[PDB]
């Protein structure tokens, strides 16, 4: 009993008649390539991608962005062609190439990258770490304005916060230095959120530091809604993620609703939904900058809970599920003696009436 | 007589768990004389070419592209002689893992 294929069979295209006149890949590698391309297409039969969670598969992206910079295609192309002509022209460069001695001025590449395709890479890192999933729930934005955050570890020491990087809570004990490029007609809002590590509410997060109505690049000049609170993961749980968000706003916005007390060491007072908070001010605020870091419990954190929050310090474990054992049988057949130990309650003799 | 010793029992090669079944780690999914089903995600291969689950979960069967190990001469030769558009396909067994890896519990509040 034959059924009928639904849509194309994979190799049905090429001609079996006259195999000798067909071009083959004599390379293992060419084959590997072709195969990996074939494994990325949406086939009509049960496939690995289907079961193993492409994570919503196709998704139409609600985009709350800053509009992409408008640049002339042809002009740019011409300029680059020229630059590469010039660079290829030199004999010095070719000498550098044949003799395997060359270096790339990494700082400049980092600058160019920040300027050009950086926003997209930062975006997909954010997608990877699920920033968008826990914040705006559906929404992707490209971080048009680069955001430079750093911490002071000492006088000469500066710990940068790149997207996804790891930082110790010791480093983060003080509010960080923040830098980005804008002229001033401008108004901005900066937000620091602890995405996980809220104790009571799985769907909610903590506001650490919220600053508002930020003129230009001036960080301190803005009115602080919520004063800086140092990172405080819990001992057991690993790697909470903290998010620095940067919104470009038009009108001056004033919120007495979102304003918090000056010391504000209560946890019920800092409880936050980035979604709701954004829904409110959605018309004026457009999210622009993003930078975030991974952070795990360290010694200094202990001081927080006791000294600031006036709490005991919660500690967690990682508990694996108990091993699965089949129903116990009255006559386990052909089973090793140690069988009887798997259903044993605790190792201690018990003499019932004796 | 001319003919002798044709008599031997069946080896019971076959496929023990079927698509959609629940398995516990170490369950044998299938057993075979030659590779018929290849091991997929979370499925270990035995030295007798039998497939067993490495994780507790649900069994799934799938068709997929076959890219042999370059240390294997024969398979690389077979792949190398193919017409340029062609791609080898084979049938795989996976286990979609059910339980979460582990949980975080509150030990003590100091």
């Amino acid at each position: 009993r034959r059924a009928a294929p639904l849509g194309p069979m994979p190799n049905e295209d090429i001609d079996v008649s006259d195999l000798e006149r067909l071009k083959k890949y004599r390379s293992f590698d060419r084959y590997r390539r072709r195969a990996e391309q074939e494994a990325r297409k949406p086939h009509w039969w049960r496939t690995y991608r289907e079961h193993f969670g492409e994570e919503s598969g196709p998704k139409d992206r609600v985009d709350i962005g800053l509009p992409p910079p408008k640049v002339s295609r042809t002009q740019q192309l011409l300029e680059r062609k020229q630059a590469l002509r010039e660079l290829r022209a030199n004999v010095e460069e070719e000498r550098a190439a044949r003799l395997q001695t060359a270096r790339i001025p990494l700082e400049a590449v980092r600058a160019e990258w920040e300027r050009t395709c950086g926003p997209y890479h930062k975006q997909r890192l954010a997608e990877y770490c699920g920033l968008y999933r826990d914040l705006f729930h559906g929404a992707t934005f490209v971080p048009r304005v680069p955001l430079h955050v750093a911490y002071a570890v000492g006088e000469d020491d500066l710990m940068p916060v790149y997207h996804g990087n790891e930082v110790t809570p010791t480093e983060a004990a003080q509010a960080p230095e923040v830098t980005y490029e804008a002229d001033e007609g401008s108004l901005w809002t900066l937000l620091l959120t602890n995405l996980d590590g809220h104790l009571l509410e799985p769907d909610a997060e903590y506001v650490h530091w919220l600053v508002t109505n930020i003129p230009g690049n001036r960080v301190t000049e803005g009115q602080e809604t919520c004063p800086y609170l140092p990172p405080f993961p819990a001992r057991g749980s690993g790697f909470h993620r903290f998010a620095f968000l940067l919104f470009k706003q038009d009108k001056r916005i004033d919120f007495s609703g979102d304003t918090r007390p000056s010391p504000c060491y209560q946890l019920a007072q800092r409880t936050f939904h980035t979604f709701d908070f954004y829904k409110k001010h959605q018309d004026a605020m457009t999210p622009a900058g993003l930078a975030f870091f991974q952070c795990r419990w360290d010694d200094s954190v202990t001081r927080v809970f006791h000294q600031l929050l006036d709490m005991r310090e919660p500690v967690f474990e990682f508990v694996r599920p108990p091993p699965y054992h089949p129903k116990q049988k009255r006559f386990p057949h052909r089973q090793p003696l140690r069988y009887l130990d798997r259903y044993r309650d605790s190792h201690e003799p018990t003499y019932g009436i004796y | 007589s001319k003919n002798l010793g044709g008599k031997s029992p069946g080896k019971r090669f076959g496929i023990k768990k079927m698509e959609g079944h629940y398995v516990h780690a170490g369950n044998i999914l299938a057993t075979q004389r030659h590779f018929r089903w290849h091991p997929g995600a979370h499925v270990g291969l035995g030295k007798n070419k039998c497939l067993y689950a490495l994780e507790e979960g649900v069994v799934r069967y799938t068709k997929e592209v076959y890219v042999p190990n370059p240390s294997n001469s024969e398979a690389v030769d077979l792949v190398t002689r193919l017409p340029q558009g062609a791609v080898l396909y084979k049938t795989f067994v996976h286990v979609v893992p059910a339980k979460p890896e582990g949980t975080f519990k509150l030990v003590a509040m100091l």
Partner: peptide, 19 residues
Amino acid sequence: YRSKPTHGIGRYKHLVKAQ
């Protein structure tokens, strides 16, 4: 499997002639 639509998906030998 013969009954299924996907039958013979892994069929190759007609592509390579080694005899």
